[PDB]
Every structure is written in structure tokens, then in C-alpha cells.
Amino acid sequence: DPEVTLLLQCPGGGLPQEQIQAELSPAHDRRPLPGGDEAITAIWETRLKAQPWLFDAPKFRLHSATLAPIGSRGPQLLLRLGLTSYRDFLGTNWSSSAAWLRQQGATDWGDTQAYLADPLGVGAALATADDFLVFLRRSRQVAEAPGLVDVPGGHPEPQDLAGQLVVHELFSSVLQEICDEVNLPLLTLSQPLLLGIARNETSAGRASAEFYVQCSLTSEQVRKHYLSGGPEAHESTGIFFVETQNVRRLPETEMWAELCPSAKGAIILYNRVQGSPTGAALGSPALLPPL
Numbered sequence: 001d002p003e004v005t006l007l008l009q010c011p012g013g014g015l016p017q018e019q020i021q022a023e024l025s026p027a028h029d030r031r032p033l034p035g036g037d038e039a040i041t042a043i044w045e046t047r048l049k050a051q052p053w054l055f056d057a058p059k060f061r062l063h064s065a066t067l068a069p070i071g072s073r074g075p076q077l078l079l080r081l082g083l084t085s086y087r088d089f090l091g092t093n094w095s096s097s098a099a100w101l102r103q104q105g106a107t108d109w110g111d112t113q114a115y116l117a118d119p120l121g122v123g124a125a126l127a128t129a130d131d132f133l134v135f136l137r138r139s140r141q142v143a144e145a146p147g148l149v150d151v152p153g154g155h156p157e158p159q160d161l162a163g164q165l166v167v168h169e170l171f172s173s174v175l176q177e178i179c180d181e182v183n184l185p186l187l188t189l190s191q192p193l194l195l196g197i198a199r200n201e202t203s204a205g206r207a208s209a210e211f212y213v214q215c216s217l218t219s220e221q222v223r224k225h226y227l228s229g230g231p232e233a234h235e236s237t238g239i240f241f242v243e244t245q246n247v248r249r250l251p252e253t254e255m256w257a258e259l260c261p262s263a264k265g266a267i268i269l270y271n272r273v274q275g276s277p278t279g280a281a282l283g284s285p286a287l288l289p290p291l
């Protein structure tokens with residue numbers, strides 16, 4: 001899977017909100033482009049002159065994520081974040097020249113991402129009460145990953161002493177995206193655990209934070225809530241479910257070639273962090289069959 005790279009695998013089966021620190025700093029921003037940010041402004045003007053109903057929106061930028069030594073007390077992760085925008089994404093990661101910008105950043109800054117917007121996404125491995133994960137089908141008419149399979153998620157919009165409010169908005173955002181797209185009541189969801197961070201090498205290395213969320217509803221009940229919104233209540237065109245038993249071997253199935261890169265990152269991290277037991281009971285051959 002060359003189109004997905006793991007940047008972070010969390011310990012302990014996943015980290016809760018209270019174990020994560022953020023540093024939001026203009027030192028963590030994109031660098032101005034070599035010949036100037038006028039190239040971004042020109043792409044945006046061309047787009048608005050065809051689609052004048054489009055709007056810009058602020059986004060968090062991922063600079064880096066440092067894990068504490070394993071087994072330590074106190075905060076376990078530091079997220080270094082900056083700010084970016086939808087407009088800066090369209091002019092950098094989404095540009096036909098994005099690979100040239102990655103080579104230039106290696107040359108000038110020793111950092112392949114220095115000239116890239118790199119907006120931070122969120123995604124969820126969402127489990128039902130009857131042990132299935134939730135998948136969504138993308139419209140064949142959208143610009144990014146048309147017709148491919150995705151998991152719930154989105155790209156959060158801004159608004160440790162401003163740090164804790166930023167971590168709160170990231171955890172809040174993945175629940176809000178589940179409620180808006182799947183149409184589930186908030187009180188049927190667990191507090192999220194962070195599983196890790198995955199990069200989409202088909203979008204010049206932009207990253208997504210991948211979370212585990214449990215729902216108290218069965219697969220039948222989740223399907224009823226999704227459908228009862230009607231076609232205008234969701235951006236996706238369908239919902240479906242895979243037993244957690246079967247997610248273990250998903251990379252060997254025909255479904256794998258249909259998954260978009262951020263959804264592949266969610267499922268790899270689910271399998272490594274929530275699956276893959278370490279103890280004698282769950283590791284016994286009848287509960288963890290060989291192959």
C-alpha cells in the first residue's frame with residue numbers, strides 16, 4: 001500500500017483526550033512558496049471564476065507528533081499544529097506541481113512537507129454493539145476519490161493553555177462528523193480513543209488522525225438511522241457493515257482496492273492497536289486462528 005504511510009501508532013490500545021497535549025504555533029505553519037504565494041492566489045481566482053459559490057475555511061496543519069517513552073506517567077503525546085486553509089490546500093497538495101513542491105522543500109528546508117498546506121483530517125473506526133465496523137460509499141461525481149469506500153470523518157475548522165481547547169475540538173469533531181453523516185444520536189457514542197496518524201501519499205502526504213469510537217446501537221439500528229435522514233441528510237450514497245472478525249484480513253479482499261487512502265489508514269491502525277492481542281487468553285489459537 002504505497003498510497004498510505006503510518007506516522008504514529010498509539011500505545012495502550014489508543015490514547016484518551018486527557019493524555020494528549022497540543023502546541024499551536026505559527027512556527028508550525030507552511031513556508032511561503034519560493035516564487036511567492038501569488039501562485040496560490042492565481043489557482044483560487046481561476047476556481048472562483050468558474051464556481052463563485054465556493055468559500056474558503058481555516059484548517060489545522062499537522063507539523064509533527066512526538067510520543068512519550070512507552071510506559072511513562074503524565075502526558076503521552078505532543079501534537080505540533082499550525083494553521084492552513086482550504087485555498088492553500090487547493091494551491092499546494094491538490095496542485096499538478098505538488099511533487100515539485102515536495103522536492104523543493106527537501107532541498108531548501110530538509111522537509112518534504114515545508115511548502116504543503118497539509119490540513120489535518122479526522123476519521124473513525126466506528127464499531128456497533130453486534131461487532132461490525134461502519135463503511136460509507138463516496139459519490140461517483142465528487143472530485144476526490146470518486147466512487148471509493150470511506151469511513152466517517154472530515155477536516156475540522158478551528159473555533160497547553162490554548163492547547164487543551166484544540167485537543168477538545170479534535171475529539172469533538174470526530175463525534176460531530178459521525179452525528180452529521182450517519183445521523184446517530186450523540187448519547188449512543190463512546191468518548192473517542194486516538195489510534196494513530198496516517199498519511200495519504202496520493203494527496204502529497206496530508207495526514208489524518210484515526211480514532212476508535214464504540215456505538216451502543218446494533219448494525220440494523222445504525223442502518224435505520226442513516227437511511228431515515230433521506231438522500232439530503234448524507235454526502236455518501238450508501239452505508240454497509242463488515243464483521244470485526246473479517247476486518248483482520250480486509251487487505252487480502254477485493255474490497256481493499258476500493259478503499260480510499262485515509263480509510264485504509266483507519267483499518268490498518270484498528271487492526272494493529274485494537275486487534276492484535278498481546279495476552280495469553282486472546283492470543284490462544286481458538287480465539288486468534290493462525291493464517
Ligand SMILES: O=C(N[C@@H]1CCCCNC1=O)c1ccco1
Nearest residue numbers: 055056057086089119144154155
Ligand atoms: O474541508 C474542506 N475541504 C477538504 C479539505 C482538504 C482535504 C480534502 N479535500 C477537501 O476539499 C472544506 C472546503 C470548504 C470548507 O471545508
